[PDB]
Scaffold this motif. Structure first.
Motif, short mmCIF file in Angstrom:
data_model
loop_
_atom_site.label_atom_id
_atom_site.label_comp_id
_atom_site.label_asym_id
_atom_site.label_seq_id
_atom_site.Cartn_x
_atom_site.Cartn_y
_atom_site.Cartn_z
N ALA A 194 0.86 -1.18 0.00
CA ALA A 194 0.00 0.00 0.00
C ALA A 194 0.88 1.21 0.00
O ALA A 194 0.55 2.20 -0.61
CB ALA A 194 -0.90 0.07 1.26
N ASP B 287 3.73 1.35 -1.39
CA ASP B 287 4.27 1.44 -2.74
C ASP B 287 3.35 2.15 -3.73
O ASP B 287 3.76 2.93 -4.50
CB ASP B 287 4.71 0.08 -3.28
CG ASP B 287 5.42 0.19 -4.64
OD1 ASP B 287 6.45 0.81 -4.71
OD2 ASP B 287 4.89 -0.32 -5.60
N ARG B 288 2.08 1.84 -3.64
CA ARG B 288 1.04 2.50 -4.39
C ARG B 288 1.04 4.02 -4.20
O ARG B 288 0.99 4.72 -5.12
CB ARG B 288 -0.32 1.86 -4.06
CG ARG B 288 -0.51 0.52 -4.70
CD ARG B 288 -1.92 0.04 -4.63
NE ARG B 288 -2.22 -0.57 -3.37
CZ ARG B 288 -1.91 -1.80 -3.03
NH1 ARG B 288 -1.30 -2.64 -3.82
NH2 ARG B 288 -2.24 -2.20 -1.86
N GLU B 289 1.16 4.47 -2.96
CA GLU B 289 1.18 5.90 -2.62
C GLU B 289 2.41 6.57 -3.20
O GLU B 289 2.34 7.61 -3.77
CB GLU B 289 1.25 6.15 -1.13
CG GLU B 289 0.22 5.59 -0.30
CD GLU B 289 0.47 5.94 1.15
OE1 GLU B 289 1.13 6.93 1.49
OE2 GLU B 289 0.02 5.20 1.98
N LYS C 145 4.32 5.43 -5.79
CA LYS C 145 4.20 5.37 -7.28
C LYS C 145 3.35 6.54 -7.87
O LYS C 145 3.63 7.01 -8.98
CB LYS C 145 3.58 4.02 -7.75
CG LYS C 145 4.47 2.77 -7.57
CD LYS C 145 5.49 2.58 -8.72
CE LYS C 145 6.63 1.63 -8.27
NZ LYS C 145 6.16 0.21 -8.12
N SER D 111 9.28 4.88 -5.62
CA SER D 111 8.87 3.56 -5.22
C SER D 111 9.17 3.34 -3.69
O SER D 111 9.96 4.10 -3.10
CB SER D 111 9.54 2.49 -6.08
OG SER D 111 10.88 2.31 -5.66
N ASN E 119 3.61 -8.50 -8.14
CA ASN E 119 2.73 -7.33 -8.07
C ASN E 119 3.41 -6.05 -8.41
O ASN E 119 2.86 -4.98 -8.18
CB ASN E 119 2.15 -7.17 -6.65
CG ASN E 119 1.10 -8.26 -6.32
OD1 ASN E 119 0.92 -8.64 -5.16
ND2 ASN E 119 0.42 -8.75 -7.32
N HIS F 110 5.86 -4.46 -7.11
CA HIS F 110 6.48 -3.54 -6.08
C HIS F 110 8.01 -3.64 -6.06
O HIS F 110 8.70 -2.73 -5.54
CB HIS F 110 5.91 -3.82 -4.71
CG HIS F 110 4.41 -3.88 -4.68
ND1 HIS F 110 3.60 -2.83 -5.05
CD2 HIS F 110 3.57 -4.89 -4.32
CE1 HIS F 110 2.33 -3.16 -4.87
NE2 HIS F 110 2.29 -4.42 -4.46
#
Ligand SMILES: [Mg+2]
Lengths: 372, 374
Positions: A132, A134-136, A138, A143, A199, A201
């Protein structure tokens, strides 16, 4: 060649500082101490000692000393209980071979989590949080995490967290019949790593120099590395911190610990001098600081001086990850084991093998670790 | 460049080879130099990197797989007509990844060697050996003594009913699939362990002991290779050399060693080396020359082997070789031998059962002798 001390230490250590401790010992005792830093000293030592020559004292990583002791090249050391009480107990564990102490622990090294305080002022306490995160990141063009996936040393802390181990360690002995590298804990940690890669990351191809480049140019918020990496991050100007590795399944990541250690050559006619020098001159606050002053030792085994140095949270973190991890085994079988695990992690991360297949192969190597 | 330098071991007929070289010079003007450096097999891989090294190297085929892996041998290119001149199974010895990387010269394997005075009609079966031994023990002798410490000597019986080393398919050995703990391998090792328990053989017999007993007329039979013949000749024992006993009605399967001639990858003389080997050495007169200087034993060349094999000892060498298997040309075989060597010592001594000793040799664990330093 009685009556003096010749000492070998690696050239990336503070040999000039250790020379100053040698000079103090000579002022007090009249015994001359000569410090050398040969290239390849750990290969040269069995060559020269096995014919009863060599230095009186050698400094190297504890794990090589198992090898030496097996060949009868190191003396049993004899510190009393009062001396042993001055060092952390887990350090004594690293310098035991057949239930006998074979070297004095000096310094301790383990991986920690290194984070970019500008990108990530509150780093994650758990592995489970990283996707989660990593999503933020990105979404900001960055990363969450990059570290070396080509060498299983860097991936091991996650593999061992839920109960994976190399060789069962009980009563001061490694049972080589009892391998833990394919148990349910090891599979869960490695499956977590494989999922991170699946995934997107992390990238299966990332290696030491790619991850160091990304961290040091501020492209990823975290890396996993050791104190040998700090001076390069200092050059980069990144505002970094160094902290506890994340937990996995609520349990600590368990990096392997390397203990810089000083052993006494079995063929030295100067064993008593070596004990006095090491116990009463080097392994004190003044002696370690003389060495540290020259090049930093990192976290140290001597509790009184470690407490002083741990005002630096980077060094406190090194010790903290070390106490949560396990001693690198000092048995000659580690090099076949690391070769098999390295293939396992690469094959699982590429899709070439499943996690269960990959690790069963590492636990039960057959002829696979006889190269070439 | 415009020359040939050949390395061969001092124990071979190098003077006979130098005479073939002279014949090449007479015809072509090319000087041929035969050297026998000490440890040539360790030197070759060192110097074929300083570009240097011989044009041709003669050695056992099994060390060649290591050289081919490192890119040190050229692919050889005989036409099919030339290939037809040599036994098909010898070409299999000199394949690495599909490609021919040497010319086979000579073939060696174990045979059953017997005292014709004590035993004019040797047993055909291992199963016969205990009743034979009982007969000879009653006369102060023994049926059979051979080196039990080195598993190269015990292998023929282990492999008889199905034991194999590394599985071999699509021209490569699969180091992950080991055949030394299958039912076949366990059957033959159990037979051998029973001969020891039953006192027909002694767990401590090594090379020297067995050689001295056969050569003094103390045991009727031994298991040895052509390198042992000349000591037996000297002893004056009246001996025969024949096919190994069968086990469960299947031939014993010894490992075969093929002396082979490889061409250095870095030679600028590969075409000269090919004409030298094909048209001068691998001929009836070429081999004759070498063999006169020191015997080759059984040779790869069909036409010359027909002549040499009117010596029944050489016929038996070739018979046993054709019943056996080529020794695997991979570096893992030294480990395989170290692991099997321990397994047989342990089974023989009761330190382990056959089932557990062979399980350990087929799938070595971290506890294995192969991963020790000591
Ligand atoms: Mg005291």
């Amino acid at each position: 060649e009685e009556g003096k001390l010749v000492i070998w230490i690696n050239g990336d250590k503070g040999y000039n500082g250790l020379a100053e401790v040698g000079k103090k010992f000579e002022k007090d005792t009249g015994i001359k101490v000569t410090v050398e830093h040969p290239d390849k000293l750990e290969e040269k030592f069995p060559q020269v000692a096995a014919t009863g020559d060599g230095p009186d004292i050698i400094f190297w990583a504890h794990d090589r000393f198992g090898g030496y002791a097996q060949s009868g090249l190191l003396a049993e050391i004899t510190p009393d209980k009062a001396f042993q009480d001055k060092l952390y107990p887990f350090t004594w564990d690293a310098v035991r071979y057949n239930g006998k102490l074979i070297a004095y622990p000096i310094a301790v090294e383990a991986l920690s989590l290194i984070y970019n305080k500008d990108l990530l002022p509150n780093p994650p306490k758990t592995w489970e949080e990283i996707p989660a995160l990593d999503r933020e990141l990105k979404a900001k063009g960055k990363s969450a995490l990059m570290f070396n996936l080509q060498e299983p040393y860097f991936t091991w802390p996650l593999i061992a967290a839920d109960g994976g181990y190399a060789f069962k360690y009980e009563n001061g002995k490694y049972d080589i019949k009892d391998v833990g590298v394919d148990n349910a804990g090891a599979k869960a940690g490695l499956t977590f790593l494989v999922d991170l890669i699946k995934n997107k990351h992390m990238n299966a191809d990332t290696d030491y120099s790619i991850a160091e480049a990304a961290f040091n140019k501020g492209e990823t918020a975290m890396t996993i590395n050791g104190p040998w990496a700090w001076s390069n991050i200092d050059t980069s100007k990144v505002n970094y911190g160094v902290t506890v590795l994340p937990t996995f399944k609520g349990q600590p990541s368990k990096p392997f610990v390397g203990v810089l250690s000083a052993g006494i050559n079995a063929a030295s006619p100067n064993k008593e001098l070596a004990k006095e020098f090491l116990e009463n001159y080097l392994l004190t606050d003044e002696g370690l600081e003389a060495v540290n002053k020259d090049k930093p030792l990192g976290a140290v085994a001597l509790k009184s001086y470690e407490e002083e140095l741990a005002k630096d949270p980077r060094i406190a973190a090194t010790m903290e990850n070390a106490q949560k991890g396990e001693i690198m085994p000092n048995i000659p079988q580690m090099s076949a084991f690391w070769y098999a695990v390295r293939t396992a992690v690469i094959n699982a991360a590429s899709g070439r093998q499943t996690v269960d297949e990959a690790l069963k192969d590492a636990a039960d190597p057959g002829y696979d670790s006889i190269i070439y």
